[PDB]
């Protein structure tokens, strides 16, 4: 992402929506859910605050933090080796290798019995209230306005309160601004193109960045003069 | 003379995937997992935008500077053959 994510509150999206005299019955309650549909459908990784947290694996299992959404990596605490993924079907089950993990709910099943692991994960950025905080980027705010507009105009169109060319224009204006907002949050900056320039341009390939914390992925590979 | 330049659109990189790590695992596997049902690609899929946003492949900045180089290489060969005739000191006489 080129721009920065300056956070603003959820009533910012209703300064913009209630300019429309057909959307005057939207609330903060409805803006809360239609924001959460929009963060997850887009799935842009810049909107999530990156947190790191250590748990204690009790017996091939540990609890998971209350604000988890998505795990970037899990690594061991003493060694530092990242745990890959559980491909086993019979993990904790004994009969008569490289470590691995699998997280379903609020529990993480590892292949190690009694250990500590650091989890680097992603959360929703909250507020002084317990409400999600949105970027003020007006490509994001405009298409978040159009998502709440499109899901409301769909409701009116099924009741018969909106012309079929009016939802068709709002579905068109969202479909451009949803692909424009996607590319705004995923195109690399000048500072992040060097981390791709040093990764791509390698005479001796580095193919084991996952054992580290993807730390040396952007490191320039220098070759001596002989 | 730099190479051909491939114009890459990253609108099909999956959700939550960093573009640094997506390309890194594409170097390795030679298999770049893409997301054709992303929310950004609702335009051509639903029919509200042009279909050229979900198809037609990638574009190339290619400049044929290599054909220009081979013309300069074949012109130096002709002159060096000419001057070897003017002096009367040919190639099999130099060798």
């Amino acid at each position: 992402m080129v721009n920065n994510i300056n956070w603003v509150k959820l009533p910012v999206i209703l300064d913009r929506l209630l300019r429309h005299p057909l959307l005057t019955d939207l609330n903060l309650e409805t803006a809360i859910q239609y924001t959460l549909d929009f963060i997850s459908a887009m799935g842009l990784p810049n909107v999530y605050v990156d947190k790191i947290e250590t748990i204690d694996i009790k017996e091939y299992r540990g609890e998971l933090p209350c604000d988890l959404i998505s795990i970037n990596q899990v690594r061991l605490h003493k060694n530092g080796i990242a745990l890959r993924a559980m491909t086993d079907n019979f993990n904790a089950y004994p009969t008569h290798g490289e470590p691995s993990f699998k997280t379903q709910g609020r529990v993480i099943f590892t292949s190690i019995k009694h250990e500590k692991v650091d989890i680097s994960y992603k959360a929703i950025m909250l507020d002084d209230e317990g409400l999600p905080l949105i970027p003020d980027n007006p490509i994001f705010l405009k298409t978040l306005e159009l998502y709440i507009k499109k899901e409301w105009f769909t409701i009116l169109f099924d009741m018969g309160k909106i012309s079929p060319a009016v939802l068709n224009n709002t579905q068109q204006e969202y479909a451009f601004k949803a692909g424009q907002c996607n590319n705004e949050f995923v195109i690399p900056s000048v500072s992040e193109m060097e981390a791709i320039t040093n990764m791509w341009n390698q005479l001796i390939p580095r193919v084991t960045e996952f054992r580290r914390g993807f730390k040396n992925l952007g490191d320039k590979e220098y070759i001596r003069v002989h | 003379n730099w190479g051909s330049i491939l114009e890459l659109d990253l609108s099909k990189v999956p959700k939550g995937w960093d573009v640094g790590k997506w390309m890194y695992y594409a170097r390795v596997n030679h298999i770049a997992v893409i997301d054709s049902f992303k929310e950004g690609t609702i335009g051509a899929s639903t029919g509200k935008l042009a279909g050229a946003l979900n198809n037609a492949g990638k574009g190339m900045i290619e400049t044929n500077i290599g054909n220009y180089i081979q013309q300069q290489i074949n012109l130096l060969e002709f002159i060096k053959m000419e001057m070897a005739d003017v002096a009367g000191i040919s190639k099999q006489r130099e060798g």
Binding site: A165, N168, Q172 | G47, K48, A50
Partner: peptide, 4 residues
């Protein structure tokens, strides 16, 4: 309508 489609084909825009």
């Amino acid at each position: 309508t489609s084909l825009p």
